[PDB]
Design a binder for these strands. Structure first.
Ligand SMILES: Nc1ncnc2c1ncn2[C@@H]1O[C@H](CSCC[C@H](N)C(=O)O)[C@@H](O)[C@H]1O
Ligand SMILES: Nc1ncnc2c1ncn2[C@@H]1O[C@H](CSCC[C@H](N)C(=O)O)[C@@H](O)[C@H]1O
Lengths: 174, 285, 285, 187
DNA sequence: GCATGTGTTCTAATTAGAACGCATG
DNA sequence: GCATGTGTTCTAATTAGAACGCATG
């Protein structure tokens, strides 16, 4: 009995993860958000989920650009201070941001990142206001291994989609 | 009718406290002036020249959202970020998203943290400054994050030096034509010490590069004194920038140390032109 | 004798024109102030800080008898010859008859040339200054050539620094005790900028050495700032010597260049005391 | 400055500094065979009152030592100038007043410049005498000395004289000659 | 007795000057 | 239009610091 969700998608396409997870057009996606003023995001209807993510490791723009452009459009899609309903946002990094860029990310998004691992193979950093993204006592993984994981990947998603999981109770329905 | 209260200012990348200096010249009461600065030379000038009125808070990246709320509400939010990675005078510029150009986004974050929320129609003024000699994309990107276009003001029309700068903000009448005052020194001759002859009316933009004090590509001396040619003195650079004489004469600083502070600073008469309409909103002496 | 007339002064080894500064401060009207100076920095200060009133004549050894006769008559002949070959602080001092020590005799010669003739009643005053830390034989010869015994006046009694200096002359009441005036700053604390704390009541004799500004055999820093030791700033040294603030802030001079001038000059209040009874003998505007 | 008749002339009173010229002035006949000439060597403590007490002077002589000098070369000139100004007569004084400073090539170019600066005149080179044997530099207010056409000596030839003499007369004693027509002659 | 001093000459660290650079209004 | 620049880097001249120095009140 809870209504479905308008999703704003940034940089990377989640039209596969949100459709295969069963989450007609309710989703808006933009790739180059350079000339996206406030009125544009406002005209694209309300939003209950604002998603943005850095490109996969080895894709073409300064890693902080994604973090800054995310913060810009995120402040555009916020509702009234008197919350009409549930609002959620999430920024996903794929080991692209270096040590400094992680400090910038945490400071601008005003919270510490949760480390999302896979058994050690593929790694993902997540900033999100979801009380269930943080609730999951996420499997601990050492940073040094994460650094080596990126180093072995130069030479050349699942439970992250389960990060979408706890969003079902707020939404609908399929 | 409720009387006007003294202004409350958050100054990011304060430098040599030009903002406070200008506000005090306009006779505007300032209750608190919380400034973020890292350079020891800059902070030392601020402490001495303003008797320690300024609450120095340190690095701009250490300033949190709660701190802005706790120290607020702020009536005025000014800032001028480093352009060493933005200006096209540097062939080794690292752009807006790398180096020190990234520090601009710190002004962007804190500006959003300082603004009143909804249902708050209280006066809130802000101003961002940078050079016009930057990248097209960078100029655009700054306008996009601040959601506003800059007003272009050259200090050439209010001082004895060329200095075309960009000004983002909502200060009352930023676009209005610039008017000359009684105490506006437009000519170089007016800025020189006694017995020194000016060769030119205006000088080019003064940078941290010491030879920018020499005019033209031929590196001409600006001033003639007593059978020899000479560059501008520190006291003369201050008068050119519209600063009080011996303003930067602190902490045994040399010529280069003083020109470094002046080089990156604002033109006082320009800032006065921009801050002048704020007198209508806050208490005055 | 119709009335008082503006004083005519001959200043040998003028330096940063401490003499004219004092004569001005006493309101004494000056007809002419002829200075013999060779240092470029020194002359520049005198030209700026005194609006080209001073008639500079160059090297003292170039000043002939005919010159003194033509330029005169002089009411006052003041001078302070180099002591870099006379002071015992220099291990390689050459003495009174070698190096720059022999420049004293140039003052002796010009004093002899500037004096009025026999039977001339008109008032004529002269003053000569040099350090106490000189050879016992050099002090003897100076007295012999000047035919007078000096008066030891330490600036510590009237300023914030030790400066034991010999003063040969004939000024009215050179022997009278020094009385601290309301304007004199007697402690180091009163000479510091805002936010600065003095570790010492009075500082030791400031020479041209970079670390003459430090105190004791342990070489202690004179002041405290933000819980961290520091040396005196240039503006502070000027207060200690009694000069106006930023008096030496000319020609982009560094700390060394500024201290080199201040180190060799006179203590302003000491000269103010000595020149004080001359306002009775001359026109005061 | 003018010449006075023989009978009105008086025996010269001489202040001879550093070096006695009691033998030179006697052989020329300025002092009688019987003892007028004050010879002072240690003028380091000599004040103005001493010279005044030591009786009026007509000829104040000065000379640098030929040998080893206990004092710097410039010391002799400065002290000479000091005492000379002490012994100068009142502006209305009558007799001839003369002074003289002699250098035996012991003053360098810098010290020579200082000498001429303090005494307000350039020196006179007096050679004697077929290679050059001896020579001296003289500063004086005696007219005949700075007027006579002495032999021209090259500077590059005077530094040679200071070389072989440091490796160690009659016409030289003619600096007192033109003083005969001003004072009493004894013979 | 014993600290003090109108200085001079060593360093490593800056200063002052010049070269470099090319996109932007 | 093209020429102007909130800069950085490198080089010799200066700086700021410190050692050295011993006769003198
Ligand atoms: N991380 C940081 N946090 C705070 N200030 C910084 C900073 N990085 C650089 N700055 C300062 O930002 C200033 C930019 S120049 C701006 C100076 C100012 N407009 C004036 O009138 O003087 C510099 O003084 C520099 O010291
Ligand atoms: N040959 C010369 N002719 C004139 N002045 C000279 C000189 N040689 C050195 N000097 C100057 O003599 C001064 C010695 S210290 C003089 C300081 C002066 N009494 C004052 O109160 O400022 C120095 O300024 C030096 O430049």
């Amino acid at each position: 009995r809870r209504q479905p969700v308008r999703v704003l998608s940034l940089f990377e396409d989640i039209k596969k993860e949100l459709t295969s997870l069963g989450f007609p057009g309710q989703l808006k996606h933009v790739v180059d958000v350079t000339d996206t003023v406030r009125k544009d995001v406002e005209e694209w209807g309300p939003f209950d989920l604002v998603y943005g993510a850095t490109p996969p490791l080895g894709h073409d723009r300064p890693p902080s650009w994604y973090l800054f452009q995310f913060h810009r459009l995120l402040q555009y899609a916020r509702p009234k201070p008197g919350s009409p309903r549930p609002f959620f946002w999430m920024f996903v990094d794929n080991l692209v941001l270096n040590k400094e860029d992680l400090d910038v990310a945490s400071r601008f998004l005003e919270m510490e990142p949760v480390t999302i691992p896979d058994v050690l193979q593929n790694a993902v950093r997540v900033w999100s206001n979801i009380p269930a993204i943080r609730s999951r006592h996420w499997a601990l993984v050492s940073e040094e291994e994460l650094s080596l994981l990126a180093q072995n990947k130069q030479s050349s998603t699942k439970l992250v989609k389960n990060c979408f999981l706890p969003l079902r109770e707020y939404f609908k329905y399929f | 009718a409720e009387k006007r209260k003294p202004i409350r200012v958050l100054s990011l990348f304060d430098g040599i406290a030009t903002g406070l200096l200008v506000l005090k010249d306009l006779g505007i009461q300032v209750d608190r002036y919380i400034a973020s600065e890292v350079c020891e030379d800059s902070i030392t000038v601020g402490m001495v020249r303003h008797q320690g009125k300024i609450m120095y808070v340190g690095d701009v990246r250490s300033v949190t959202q709660k701190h802005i709320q706790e120290w607020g509400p702020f009536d005025l939010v000014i800032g001028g970020s480093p352009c060493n990675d933005l200006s096209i005078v540097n062939p080794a510029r690292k752009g807006l998203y790398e180096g020190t150009g990234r520090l601009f986004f710190e002004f962007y974050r804190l500006l959003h943290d300082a603004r009143p929320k909804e249902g708050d129609d209280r006066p809130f003024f802000w101003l961002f400054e940078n050079v016009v000699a930057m990248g097209v994309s960078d100029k655009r990107d700054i306008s996009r994050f601040l959601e506003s276009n800059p007003v272009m003001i050259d200090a050439k029309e209010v001082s004895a030096a060329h200095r075309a700068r960009y000004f983002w903000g909502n200060l009352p009448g930023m676009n209005r034509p610039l008017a000359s005052t009684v105490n506006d020194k437009l000519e170089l001759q007016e800025c020189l010490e006694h017995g020194r002859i000016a060769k030119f009316s205006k000088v080019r933009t003064i940078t941290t590069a010491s030879n920018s004090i020499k005019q033209g590509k031929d590196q001409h001396f600006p001033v003639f004194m007593n059978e020899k040619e000479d560059i501008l003195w520190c006291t003369e650079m201050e008068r050119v920038f519209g600063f009080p004489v011996h303003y930067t004469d602190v902490s045994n600083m040399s010529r280069l140390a003083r020109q470094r502070l002046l080089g990156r600073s604002w033109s006082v008469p320009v800032i006065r032109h921009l801050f002048a309409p704020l007198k209508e909103y806050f208490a005055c002496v």
